[model samples]
Target: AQYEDGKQYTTLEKPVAGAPQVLEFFSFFCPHCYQFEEVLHISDNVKKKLPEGVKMTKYHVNFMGGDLGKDLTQAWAVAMALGVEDKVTVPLFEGVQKTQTIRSASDIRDVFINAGIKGEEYDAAWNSFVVKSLVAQQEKAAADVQLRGVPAMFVNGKYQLNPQGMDTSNMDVFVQQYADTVKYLSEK
Candidate 1:
């Protein structure tokens, strides 16, 4: 339904427990999600501004339905396993969106290398059972939400943010506002 921001968002029937969770449903191949990554710096000020008792995670979208999508998604899961998501997320996004250098699993592996992750280390994580499990979870999470697009944000798994219709030129402002809106809604 519509909100004060003049945008519509979906409210999940079953919200997750613990610190209000912020989930970003994204894709490495989505230009819109890439733009958000470019402007948000999610691991930086945005994270610092999150209210106490709030936690954030990213779910890589898998709808691309090809080797490129599958490989990139697997890389994301591996990055998460290595605990290097915060460090590699933006660079990976830039690698694909800006540099256009990432087009396959090996390409993503190379991008991880440029991010300072050891090739052997990345190889281990990329093929680990833990990374596979996380990848499965991401698939289920997106399916559960019936996700149809990237760059979607969910607060506590309850309130979703409609980031469309906002001024792209003023992303920093909108990003903060989005966080504030999430904080407000999560409290309610």
Candidate 2:
């Protein structure tokens, strides 16, 4: 299908409803997700350009981390539970993808501590029922999506970005196409 036909996406059987929302699934260990955050600035760009009332949610995928996968997902949930994702996303990504400094749960805890989050508060969130529930939800989300790879985005719970139909050769074009596609779907 032609992208100009606005066919740069696939419609899911059951559109996940966020009432005009974007659900992004990614793994911290993925170099591509890092590039998406660092170079393309996909999240920031699309978020800014989207219509008002459109909400975006990021789900940390656990398909690639082996044992550490669950650990990292739990860490992500902990950050979310503590409302510290903005404070911790980069550090966690850097630790896993850049410095390779994060090895386990305690390492993740230290990163949150370094971000000025109280160690006691982080620990409380880390082991709390809320964080545990978020972890379960994120894990279930990955399974429900049936991801074949990292860094996938769904709009309005139904349409998934299909890079094959979009401009993927140049990062800039891809980002624009992505923003356009997701924005378009969000409106639908």
Candidate 3:
């Protein structure tokens, strides 16, 4: 079921027993997501200032683009599967932005290789149940939380950001709000 208040936890993954985790729900095709990247160092630095025991994770959204963006989406899924996000995220980012347009799956795969992720790892991670499960999880959360935009966050079973309308200029405030919220929540 869904709730309008902060009690909503339908789309948010249940914490791992005693472990607390934060969710970052974002889509690659979002201008805001891209814009947020412009201010990422600041946001990341703020997040770094958070207290201990508060962990963060990301879930990429795939609700935009046409066939042209399919490769980027699928490649993102592949990178997540292979645990090579650090190696592949920026490369894929550059690949997508190399021109005004994106290419097909083959192009994305080539970028993946150049990012140091082998095709085998890509195949394994992209096709694994774990990755599939993550995709399914993101879809469920998107629907349940009524997310209408990309690059949202959920903190401790509560929606932290409105996924649909965040912009680069205001993203820092939103991220800081989340960091503060998480800190306040963790203190409880």
Candidate 4:
């Protein structure tokens, strides 16, 4: 119930301003994020509960693998550009978490295919200029945040939620409280 600046969150080095946004910087390969999605449903709940006009967006970061991680981020951007996130998000997490099948670009391409996205269409989106730019933007956000870990959330791009130190003693309190905190910071 108690949160302090250093313990609960930290101010960003370079604050971002625009429409009220809740930016989630995460990776499919992150086990914590997978659990957050699979069992806790934290991301889903947060999105559903966010205040009106507050947009919640996710950026698949390139901080996990080397060249492979870059390819993974590009896959995410491709999905975003094609508007198939709802179709592929869960499968991607399942591949990376449960089956552990994602090892290269082709493997990532398969996730999109498994989601009913055609290989040709995936390639078209993957090579599109918009997807390329989106990929770069995700990478840039990771760099801008000086990211140290995955499953991090930024409220209005000014405050980074400190997941590790936050009280997670209770599930009901944890998920809704995070949403409330995001709303608070968004207004602040």
What TM-score, computed on C-alpha atoms, does each candidate reach? Answer: 0.84, 0.90, 0.70, 0.90
Worst 10 residues of 1 by lDDT: 1-10
lDDT of 2 by residue, 34-77 (tens): 88887888888899889987778888877788878778888889
How much lDDT does candidate 1 score? 0.74
Reference-based lDDT, each prediction: 0.74, 0.81, 0.58, 0.80
lDDT (Cα) of model 3: 0.58
Q: Write the per-residue lDDT of candidate 3 for residues 41-145, one digit (tens) a residue.
A: 423643676676667666666667766554455566667767776776655555566454346776677777777777787767767888777667656655655
Give model 4 RMSD, 1 decimal.
Answer: 2.0
Cα shift from native, residue 57, model 1 (Å): 0.9
TM-score of 3: 0.70
Report the lDDT tens digits of candidate 4 across residue range 69-170: 788788889988889988888888887778888888889898888889998999989899999889878877777768879888888778988767666789
Report the error of model 3 at residue 138, Å. 2.3
Instruction: Give me the displacement of residue 122 in model 3, in angstroms.
Output: 1.8
Model 1 spans with C-alpha error above 4 angstroms? 1-8, 13-20, 42-46, 165-169
Residues 59-126 of candidate 1 have per-residue lDDT tens digits of 78878647888888888898888888877887787777788887677888887898899989999888
Worst 10 residues of 2 by lDDT: 1-10
